[PDB]
Amino acid sequence: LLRCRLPGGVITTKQWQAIDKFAGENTIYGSIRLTNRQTFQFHGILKKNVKPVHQMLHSVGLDALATANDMNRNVLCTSNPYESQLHAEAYEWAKKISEHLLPTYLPRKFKTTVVIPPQNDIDLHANDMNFVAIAENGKLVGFNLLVGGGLSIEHGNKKTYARTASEFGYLPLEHTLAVAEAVVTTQRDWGNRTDRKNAKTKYTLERVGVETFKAEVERRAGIKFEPIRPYEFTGRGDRIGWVKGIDDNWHLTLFIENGRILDYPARPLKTGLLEIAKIHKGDFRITANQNLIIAGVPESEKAKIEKIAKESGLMNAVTPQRENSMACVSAPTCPLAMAEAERFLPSFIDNIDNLMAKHGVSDEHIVMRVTGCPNGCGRAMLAEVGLVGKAPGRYNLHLGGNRIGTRIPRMYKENITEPEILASLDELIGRWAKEREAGEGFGDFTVRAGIIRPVLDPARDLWD
Numbered sequence: 001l002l003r004c005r006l007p008g009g010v011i012t013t014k015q016w017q018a019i020d021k022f023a024g025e026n027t028i029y030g031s032i033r034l035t036n037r038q039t040f041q042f043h044g045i046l047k048k049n050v051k052p053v054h055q056m057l058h059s060v061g062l063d064a065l066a067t068a069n070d071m072n073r074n075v076l077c078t079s080n081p082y083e084s085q086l087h088a089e090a091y092e093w094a095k096k097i098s099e100h101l102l103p104t105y106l107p108r109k110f111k112t113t114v115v116i117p118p119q120n121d122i123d124l125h126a127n128d129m130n131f132v133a134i135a136e137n138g139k140l141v142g143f144n145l146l147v148g149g150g151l152s153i154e155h156g157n158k159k160t161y162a163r164t165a166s167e168f169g170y171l172p173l174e175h176t177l178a179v180a181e182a183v184v185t186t187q188r189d190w191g192n193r194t195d196r197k198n199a200k201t202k203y204t205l206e207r208v209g210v211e212t213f214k215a216e217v218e219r220r221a222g223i224k225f226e227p228i229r230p231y232e233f234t235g236r237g238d239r240i241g242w243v244k245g246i247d248d249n250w251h252l253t254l255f256i257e258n259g260r261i262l263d264y265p266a267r268p269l270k271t272g273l274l275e276i277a278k279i280h281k282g283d284f285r286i287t288a289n290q291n292l293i294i295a296g297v298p299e300s301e302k303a304k305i306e307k308i309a310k311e312s313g314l315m316n317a318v319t320p321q322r323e324n325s326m327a328c329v330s331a332p333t334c335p336l337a338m339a340e341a342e343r344f345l346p347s348f349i350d351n352i353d354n355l356m357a358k359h360g361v362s363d364e365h366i367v368m369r370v371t372g373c374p375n376g377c378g379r380a381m382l383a384e385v386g387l388v389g390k391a392p393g394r395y396n397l398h399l400g401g402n403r404i405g406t407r408i409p410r411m412y413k414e415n416i417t418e419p420e421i422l423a424s425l426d427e428l429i430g431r432w433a434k435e436r437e438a439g440e441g442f443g444d445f446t447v448r449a450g451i452i453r454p455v456l457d458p459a460r461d462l463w464d
C-alpha cells in the first residue's frame with residue numbers, strides 16, 4: 001500500500017515533473033490518480049520499480065507513509081479559501097501537524113484536517129480530528145476542535161456506522177500540537193483494539209461518552225477548552241476556473257473527472273499538466289474533490305496557462321452537477337470493490353445530467369457520490385445522494401445528506417441497479433424542482449417532504 005505524504009495537497013512543479021515521469025515510464029496504467037485526501041497515487045507498479053519509486057520520491061523531497069505500522073493518513077487543508085491570505089498559515093499548521101504525527105501504534109487508522117470556513121471541501125465529518133480555523137485581522141488565532149468522524153460501515157452489521165464529528169471547544173493556536181497529541185494518545189489508550197471493526201475513534205467516543213473523552217484530552221493537553229467560536233459552512237465544492245488570490249496572483253482550478261490524469265484521445269490531460277508545470281511560477285494544489293489548482297499565477301501569465309489548459313482538455317466545460325459528483329477508485333485495481341465507482345461515474349452523471357435538464361434544473365447541483373463498497377472511500381455517506389456498492393451493478397441508495405456535509409444520509413433503497421436508481425431519482429428530482437423552497441438543497445428537501453427520515457444520532461438511529 002503506497003500512501004504518499006503531501007500535507008494540504010501542495011506539490012511543487014519540480015515534484016510534479018518527477019511523478020509525471022514515473023507514472024508514464026514505470027507503471028502499468030500510466031496515470032496520476034489524484035485522491036480525495038489531497039495526494040496522488042500510481043497504479044500497477046511492478047516488482048522492478050518498488051525501490052525506484054521510493055528513490056524517486058526522495059529525490060524531490062517526498063516520502064510515503066509506512067502504512068504497515070503508521071496509522072496516520074494525509075493531513076488535509078482547505079485548498080482555496082475565500083480569504084486567500086489565510087491559506088499560508090493554515091497550510092503551515094497542516095504541515096506541522098503532519099510532521100508531529102510521524103512515527104504510539106494506533107488501534108486503527110487516524111485521519112486529520114485543517115479547515116477554513118466557510119468551505120468544508122475537506123469533508124471534516126469523515127475525519128477523526130478536525131481543526132477549524134478562527135482568524136482575526138487575517139491572522140490565525142486558534143481552532144475549534146471536532147473529533148470522531150468516520151464513514152466506514154459493513155453491510156448488514158448494525159454494530160458499524162458512519163458518524164459525524166463532535167465539537168469539543170476552542171483552543172488558542174499555541175496549544176494545537178498538545179491537543180493533537182492528547183486526542184491521538186487518548187484514542188490509542190481507549191480504543192477497542194481487539195475488534196478491528198470497533199476500534200475507530202467514532203466507536204471509542206460512543207463507548208465512553210463525548211464529555212469523558214473531552215475531559216481526558218483537556219487533562220493530558222494541560223488546557224481547558226473555551227466555548228466554540230462561531231463558524232458556518234456554505235459548501236464543499238471547488239472553485240472551478242479562475243479566482244483572484246493574494247497580491248496580483250490568480251488560482252486556476254481544473255476539473256479532472258475522477259482525478260484520473262492520462263492522455264486521452266483529443267484530450268492530452270497529462271501532457272498538458274506537464275507543459276503547465278514547466279512554465280508555471282508557483283505550486284499546484286491537489287484538492288479533496290480530486291481536482292487540481294494551478295496556484296499563484298501572476299496576472300501576466302494567465303493567458304499562457306489558460307492556453308495550454310484549454311487546448312489539452314483540462315478546461316472542458318461540464319455541468320455544476322458533474323463538478324459536485326465524486327467516486328472512489330474501485331475496479332479494476334481495488335481488491336475490495338463490490339461495484340464499479342470511478343468507471344461508472346461518467347456515464348451515470350451523463351444520465352443524471354439528462355434528468356436535471358428534463359426537470360429544468362441544469363444550473364443546480366446535488367452532492368452525489370458513488371463508493372464501490374461500504375468502506376466508504378468515495379464519501380457517499382456524507383452525500384445528498386449516495387450510492388454504496390453491494391454487488392456487480394448493484395448499489396444501496398442513500399438520501400438526505402446536505403450540501404455542507406454535516407448529516408449522514410439514511411438508506412432509501414437496498415441492492416438496486418442503475419435503471420432502478422435513475423427511475424427513483426427521476427421522480428424525486430422532479431418533485432424537488434417543483435416543490436423546493438428558495439435555495440433549498442435536494443437532500444434537505446427529501447427530509448422536509450418526508451421522502452426519507454433524517455439521521456439524527458447515527459450510533460443509535462442510522463439503521464432501520
Ligand code: SRM
Pocket residue numbers: 001003034035036037038039040041073074108111123126149150151152153200290327328329330333334335336375376377378379
Ligand atoms: C484513493 C482513495 C479513493 C479515491 O478515489 O480518492 C482510497 C482508496 C482505497 N482505500 Fe480508502 N481511499 C481513499 C479515501 C478514503 C476515505 C475518505 C477520506 O479519508 O476522506 C475513507 C472513508 C473515511 C473513513 O476512513 O472513515 C476511506 C476508507 C477506507 C477503509 C475503511 C476504513 C475503516 O475505518 O474501516 C479501507 C479499508 C481498510 O482500511 O481496511 C480503505 C482502503 C482503501 C484501499 C487501499 C483498498 C485496500 O485496503 O486494499 C483503496 C485502494 C483503491 C485503489 O486501487 O487505488 N479505505 N478511504 C482515497 C485515498 C485517500 C488517501 O490519499 O489516503
Ligand code: SF4
Pocket residue numbers: 328329330331334335336337338341371372373374375376377378
Ligand atoms: S470504497 Fe471500497 S471499492 Fe472503493 S476504493 Fe474504497 S475499498 Fe475500494
Ligand SMILES: [K+]
Pocket residue numbers: 255256257258259289290291
Ligand atoms: K474531480
